[PDB]
Ligand binder design. Structure first.
Ligand SMILES: *[C@@H]1O[C@H](CO)[C@@H](O)[C@H](O)[C@H]1NC(C)=O
Ligand SMILES: *[C@@H]1O[C@H](CO)[C@@H](O)[C@H](O)[C@H]1NC(C)=O
Ligand SMILES: *[C@@H]1O[C@H](CO)[C@@H](O)[C@H](O)[C@H]1NC(C)=O
Lengths: 476, 29
């Protein structure tokens, strides 16, 4: 027969695919993009004052930060209703914002004795081993006294420069602008951001009851030890009161069905290990079902963990005059999104197993399968020279171009050169002699000498496969 | 006199490079 095995496995997979696609449509709503877009435009893309033109994403000094804090920040947080604050007359600001500072201590570094006279004090780069832990300034409140990470319920962040801690000098702002302005003015008067500060975070969250969807906001400016300011931002639209409407019940049923399907796939894949052939891993169609099963199990575990610890919401709802600590849920939401996206991609890729219904598709599948070894053999020789070029660019230009500032940036810049996106208008001034040589030689040796070998291999293999299957038919 | 310093979050590249070369020259050999 053999028709009752290749067709049952198809029908038991199409249901899995439609369930997964239903969940995917359920996650990504169209009411999410505009929410984030309006919030981002309100907070990042407005000038700090009517006179200056520097918005948040173009901070260049520590004094501009103080213009932003008492300025376009308070101008966006607190709105007068037409007491509580509704940010767009729709989004409710729940709780109070928090501002936290990370700083180091003088004498963490050593200045050489030769020039020790002119240099008085030095502050090292940020590291947990050299982090200040002593009171400073007027030791009255909680903004001048170190507090441990466990006493803030904080966690690391992995910023652009370093991986900052969760402990520091924090201060909770007020529910009304007339008090937050006074608090920030008091902070500015007695210098709170001196030369020793290394990072400064601002956190708050909103609700927008029209569509049940929270949104947590984090704003980070980090001052490196070499001077300057590096701003960063993050807006995450969570959803924590999910079971409200009928569609939510339908999605819950879909998740339960997905869990049953994953259990079925686990048992029907472990049945083909000990009952049948073992170490059959030279197939690529059974090395892909294990990936799907593992990723789905990880996603189920992550979802259970991130929905089984929601005590922060109830704790905040009991007393609604404190800072709502939603910064942990917004991390697991990101991880869940990444895992779900990768799992969906691999499930969609798995469809290639079931398209061989005629000769014109079997020929293409065989052509793809027979040239994989040759392509893998050439890809190593291609990528060795690719990485040699990347490291050469990193060492030569990697200080003054920005596009080659790190190894990953070099790799992506070279890929964009292959696409023909970037032009060498800025490479030349970085180095007069090696500017044009690198560009022209890279293009010459990676655009029509080593890039055409893939085309040659693929064309030759396709011609050979078609010739062989034609000659096979020429004996009937 | 065994100690547990762990005083830095940085990485030393000389030891890593030396070990990597001493292992690749064994694999190919
Ligand atoms: C920090 O310590 C150095 C000595 O290592 C001292 O010269 C400097 O004045 C100190 N900084 C402040 C703000 O007191
Ligand atoms: C702490 O803040 C209070 C606020 O009134 C004020 O007395 C002063 O600025 C600081 N120092 C002390 C000792 O209170
Ligand atoms: C940390 O969480 C506890 C609840 O486990 C809470 O009582 C405490 O206030 C939180 N820390 C801060 C600084 O709010």
């Amino acid at each position: 027969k053999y028709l009752k095995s290749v067709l049952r496995e198809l029908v038991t997979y199409l249901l899995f695919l439609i369930v997964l696609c239903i969940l995917t449509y359920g996650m990504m709503s169209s009411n999410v993009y505009y929410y984030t877009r309006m919030m981002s435009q309100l907070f990042l893309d407005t000038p700090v004052s009517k006179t200056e033109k520097t918005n948040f994403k173009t901070l260049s000094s520590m004094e501009d930060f103080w213009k932003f804090t008492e300025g376009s920040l308070l101008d966006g947080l607190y709105w007068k209703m037409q007491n509580r604050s509704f940010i767009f007359y729709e989004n409710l600001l729940l709780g109070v914002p928090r501002i936290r500072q990370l700083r180091v201590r003088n004498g963490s570094c050593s200045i050489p004795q030769d020039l020790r006279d002119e240099i008085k004090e030095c502050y090292d780069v940020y590291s947990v081993s050299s982090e200040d832990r002593a009171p400073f300034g007027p030791r009255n409140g909680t903004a001048w006294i170190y507090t441990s990470e466990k006493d803030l319920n904080g966690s690391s962040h992995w910023g652009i420069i370093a991986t900052y801690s969760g402990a520091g000098y924090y201060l909770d702002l007020s529910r009304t602008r007339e008090e937050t302005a006074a608090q920030v003015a008091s902070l500015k008067k007695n210098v709170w951001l001196d030369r020793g500060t290394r990072a400064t975070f601002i956190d708050f969250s909103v609700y927008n009851a029209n569509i049940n969807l929270f949104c947590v906001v984090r704003l980070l400016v980090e001052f490196p030890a070499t001077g300057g300011v590096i701003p960063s931002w993050q807006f995450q639209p969570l959803k924590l009161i999910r079971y409200v409407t009928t569609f939510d019940f339908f999605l819950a049923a879909c998740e339960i069905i997905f869990c049953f399907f994953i259990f079925y796939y686990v048992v029907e894949e472990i049945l083909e290990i000990r009952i049948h052939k073992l170490h059959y891993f030279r197939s690529f169609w059974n090395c892909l079902d294990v990936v799907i099963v593992v990723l789905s199990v990880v996603a189920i575990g992550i979802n259970i963990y991130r929905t089984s610890n929601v005590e922060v919401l109830l704790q905040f709802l009991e007393d609604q005059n404190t800072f709502p600590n939603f910064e942990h849920l917004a991390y697991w939401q990101i991880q869940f999104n990444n895992i779900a996206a990768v799992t969906v991609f691999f499930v969609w890729i798995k469809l290639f197993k079931f398209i061989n219904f005629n000769r014109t598709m079997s020929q293409l599948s065989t052509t793809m399968s027979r040239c994989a070894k040759d392509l893998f053999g050439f890809a190593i020789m291609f990528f060795i020279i690719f990485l040699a070029y990347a490291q050469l660019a990193y060492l030569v230009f990697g200080t003054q171009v920005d596009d080659f500032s790190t190894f990953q940036e070099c790799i992506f810049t070279q890929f964009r050169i292959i696409l023909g996106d970037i032009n060498f208008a800025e490479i030349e001034e970085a180095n007069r002699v090696l500017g044009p040589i690198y560009f022209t030689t890279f293009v010459f040796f990676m655009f029509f000498i080593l890039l055409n070998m893939f085309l040659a291999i693929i064309n030759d293999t396709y011609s050979e496969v078609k010739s062989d299957l034609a000659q096979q038919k020429a004996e009937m | 006199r065994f100690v547990f310093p762990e005083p830095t979050a940085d990485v030393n590249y000389i030891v890593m490079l030396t070990c990597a070369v001493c292992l690749v020259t064994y694999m190919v050999m």
